[PDB]
């Protein structure tokens, strides 16, 4: 039983992005949705917190909100031209911030709050106030480029908190493991030429950004060797993701020797997600958390911070997030994941599992870890 | 430009199945859904018809409803013990018809209507009134066992229409191709010992029924060799599904020589579906329809009937169904699928594509077609 | 049994107006809605048509769509400055057309189609092709001022069709009876100085526009005496509305002697509506339709056109609209309104009923009809 | 600034009641709803709490949950025959508990929790731990008869807490003021023959139970004179409700001299509610709370407990509940009710206001208070 922080704020559920039919904007041949719909609905994140409450887990955590990330915090990552336009659209009722980047009224302040939850979670663990922490950051961060919103992300949540910790708290080497099912292209770009931040992405081959695999992009200049892309095959499930972690991610952590491990923790690799094609269940996320926590215990005194990213299965993500918080806190509630046994039966058979293992083996060899 | 029937009835959208959070029943650890949700929502089927209307396709089709399947029709497939319990629950306001089989008030009559749309679509094509036909049958049929509801299905839609056509219209050999992403276990079971109906299922390996692949189940007795299961790898997309059709399904059709080809046409292999993990787009469904229509032209005077099964991506299924109706009617509207290019970029790379091709090749060899 | 036209088009259900929590725009202290919500949802209008289908009424009507109102049609009512801005916002993806006037992508074309359904319904009845007609016009029209959108209305549906009929079909005197629960301020303004169009509004005192009663606004110049406002007391129900019709509206019709009677037919006086406080049920709307149809038989050869306006009780409006179409067509289906008896019991007692009767009596005397 | 308790539990939002189209059950002529809908959705209560959080009010309150009401607690009000059937249906997955009484899985435990929140709120104020308290009890209580569920209510929340306080805490005279817009028939029945509990209901004449006004039902036996029904006219607004309070309710409180004042606090008199026809706004509820709090200060040392009942305007109830909590706590947030000015303009004009005042005057005279 560890002292585990949970950083969240009701306001993060109020960020809106206009009318969508799942991911499609309304208009032309896309009929308006009759009820809910839009993928980045707050309901997925809210239902996770709701389940944490009814399970009795919440009162055993250190609950916190946070001051929003300041303008100085944002400027470590994003140029003023981007921030001023983001704020302008937000200030004027919402609208488009470039193609496929809809935001709502006050989304600017809410995005800053989301980034601040990450900032505070990182600071608390580094100072030793908490053993580990989870930040329920909405909107997400890991696709956000310095000057371009992408994939529902408007600020670079994890990079903002990292650069803050580097300027204010003397943070050294840090590893960012991104197991959101989509490529962490924002994190990758920001740290591409830097050897002080090790960026690792496990992602469905070609999912988002579309067509990007990226195993050959290892970083540039001083950063060469300090970026790792693991494009897993669409359809992969529990065995494949855990194999990738233990075979590539953990050995990379051991070679890098970080002061802190941050997870870009998306759940959209879950077996019901509409936005990707992987077959993970709640125990998959439970095991992956155990793997990185134990690495944290060996490498940086257990210092581990997880920042929420994606996840779009409204009824199933809550069980995956509870599993992560149970593993992170070391507290097991009475909740049994009602789809666990079902998804276990759906797992790829041994021919696929071994084919995927081969491919992970080649990646490990390509990255100098085998 | 063919004379294409479209069989549908507003009442089929009124069948309900109680409260669900996507697929999970409400209760215990499953929070009630705040808005829409439940997977077998009518909205997916309605949005397809709506798009057919606004695209201008609908008036160029032969629109029809149908008389419901009669009690005699149902009795060719289902025993009275099952039918009487189904009707009893339906008559008393809805409820459970065995584990995981929720139905609503009047679901019995609506299920009979759904089966009747299939009955009529088959009869019209056989009589030469239409060149081909599509039946928007809701609730679906292909998981329904004679005495057990499964997978949202309460009557065996396609088998009921087939046995009707065999008793009333002298129908001989027929092939049923099931490209709903889940295994057509209901069709398979009903015809397992029969050589007059060739049953073929393309399905995600192990998806539903969970854990079932089934390549080795070829039929029994006189039916041995007349059932074909193609368990494709989760994650497979456009290349893999079309390869399976041309490599296994078409050659099997040519050897069997049917009088009629019926498609169990589900769309849940689409790249956004929450209930499976395949990567098909609208052109995938367009090409598969072309493949089976051209087979129909060579083998049974173009006689082709498609019966709607699954499909749970509420914004994307409509574009897939429009594509099928465009291919089936030979009429192309102005509608461009707004996600086509996106999903094309997400397709598995050549290593997976070739691995899956190998596996299809082994299946073809196992089935005596190579 | 009359030849009754029903003018509708699926596209009218696709007009959207952004994100709303019932009537409130999202932002500030207004949390985004978790599911459906926004008042001018298409679902109310769609559920009426759906019920018409399942009841068996639809095939006994003359179903039609219409060519959209042309730019010349719109210019009889609206100045180019307003139309060009409306089209500009619509053409650029939707947005605000002045304060509290949100519209969506393509709303311009859909509004023109809505107005065209009214245009065609009026033309068919005038030419004697139909005995009477109903136009399911969405978006609504009766609050639209020449140069200002108001109350969900972006074009003046009924005035556009009237002026079209006056220029193309030699239409003379016409009476417009508006029993939408809100004041028909758009119709009133357009015809304020004209004696060739008699405009009558029954509306909840002060509801919308807010604070407007209007009994003393009788028209201006040549139009003085040709506008009639009946501000009924919030809470009034079946007795009060029918009394107002027979006591003020019918006698006014008899004195004016119209060539055509058009109903601005809103249902938001229904006993469940969130946007007003009246207690009407389906038989109330059935009786009001009978009253105006019989007036039409006496005054203008039965020529009666009804144009859909408001109505925001998603489960109850469909029964009210069916009732109107049953009365209009002279066809009674098997449908019994499941809330009729309930709402009948909720009706104001005799003290209120008589107080409201007194007030109607004073209005009748004020208008020279008693 | 008072010490104000707020009793709530996430589990109360999980009680479900099956599929409804607003208030209508699905089936027959009632089409299933496409999105949200059903009137007793948790969203109304949740959005109030959400707004309390984002406004900054919540941390200034004493937040509490409660132990559920025990079986002994329930038995002070309800017979075992009713409780055992309620629990049986709840234990078996939900279903009907008599006509028009749908409940869901585990609704029994959740109803007990709802009643326990009321029990605890009453106990805390009586013991002097809090100055006043609000209980966010869902499901509601005030229509529940001892042996019959009615109007969304399955246990008699306020009577259960009262009888508990009378047996365990020596509670004497108590007054229950019910300003939910519907008649508190459950409270009335339970205390009909008792002079130790004064029951007062302000309600829309004839709304629910339908057709019931009840001014002449004053209580029976020893209870005669200790029940007060104020059937206000549908359509009444701010002036009328406040006049009734000051003219009938406050003088009745002063004559009775209670030890405690409990409000059955429903918000469905709000000007947007689908289930009644009154025109109250947030300041109306703010003023009514002030009136009863000041009475509490004069009569029973400020001891005031409010228990949540109805309220079905999903976007507007939250502003009314915030207003009540602001008045109750003596803390004003920055939130301005965005519809206040609008609803103020909709208020009945002076003719109605004076007519309603007359009727209240007669009631006051009938009850011996003028
Ligand atoms: K995405
Ligand atoms: K790097
Ligand atoms: K990733
Ligand atoms: K299924
Ligand atoms: K067979
Ligand atoms: K299949
Ligand atoms: K309005
Ligand atoms: K006029
Ligand atoms: K009106
Ligand atoms: K009620
Ligand atoms: K009493
Ligand atoms: K009341
Ligand atoms: Zn993602
Ligand atoms: Zn399927
Ligand atoms: Zn209206
Ligand atoms: Zn109520």
Numbering used by the authors:
A (entry chain C), B (entry chain C), C (entry chain C), D (entry chain C): 2 to 371
Sentences from the paper on this structure:
Structurally, these enzymes are composed of a central eight-stranded parallel β-sheet flanked by α-helices on each site, known as the α/β-arginase/deacetylase fold. All active site residues were conserved, as shown by the multiple sequence alignment and the structural alignment, suggesting a general acid/base catalytic mechanism for the bacterial enzymes as described for the eukaryotic counterparts. These enzymes mediate catalysis using a penta-coordinated catalytic Zn2+ ion coordinated by two aspartates and a histidine (KpHdaH (1b): Asp181, Asp269, His183).
All cluster 1 enzymes eluted as apparent trimer or tetramer from the analytical SEC column, and our crystal structures confirmed the formation of tetramers for sub-cluster 1b enzymes. The L1-loop of each monomer, acting as molecular glue, contacts all three remaining monomers of the tetramers. This is mechanistically achieved by the presence of a proline-rich loop, the RPP-motif (general: RPPXHH; KpHdaH: 139-RPPGHH-144; RwDhmhA: 136-RPAGHH-143; RsPrpH: 148-RPAGHH-153). In KpHdaH (1b), RwDhmhA (1b) and RsPrpH (1b), being robust deacetylases, the sequence is EGGY (KpHdaH (1b): 310-EGGY−313) the presence of glutamate further restricting the volume of the foot pocket. Notably, for all sub-cluster 1b enzymes, except for RwDmhA (1b), we found an acetate molecule in the active site coordinating the active site Zn2+ ion.
